[PDB]
Write a protein that binds this ligand. Sequence first.
Ligand SMILES: CCCCCCCS[C@@H]1O[C@H](CO)[C@@H](O)[C@H](O)[C@H]1O
Lengths: 67, 67
Amino acid sequence: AVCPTGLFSNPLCCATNVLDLIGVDCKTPTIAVDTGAIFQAHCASKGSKPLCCVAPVADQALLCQKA
Amino acid sequence: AVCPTGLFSNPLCCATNVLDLIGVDCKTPTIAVDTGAIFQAHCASKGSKPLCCVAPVADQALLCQKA
Ligand SMILES: CCCCCCCS[C@@H]1O[C@H](CO)[C@@H](O)[C@H](O)[C@H]1O
């Protein structure tokens, strides 16, 4: 997968990050993200970072880890 | 690598985990853990899980993410 299983299992595209534990301005991908390269490329095309977060939906500030 | 870069970049072998945010009874690897398979096997040989943690030191309870 592109994220580990467990709490931090949801791939999101986030505008930025804080201390590799929080994602800021996070949105769900608009494609299936089958590989890490594709996840990174998809988010990058929107200016965002590919993070693995605790929720599968968009929000302004989330617990997220680096992919 | 076996851990992302950033704050949670330190591979440790931890006896257990809590909420994919805490590693419990963590120790540094005693061999080089240069691939995910080697990391997993090494930690498993001590009954432990391969976690990516915020410090490169043995510690009983610290911030760690799933690899
Ligand atoms: C938002 C929390 C960010 C976590 C940073 C962990 C860096 S690891 C460890 O953390 C100790 C506190 O538990 C600090 O006293 C010590 O200086 C630091 O090296």
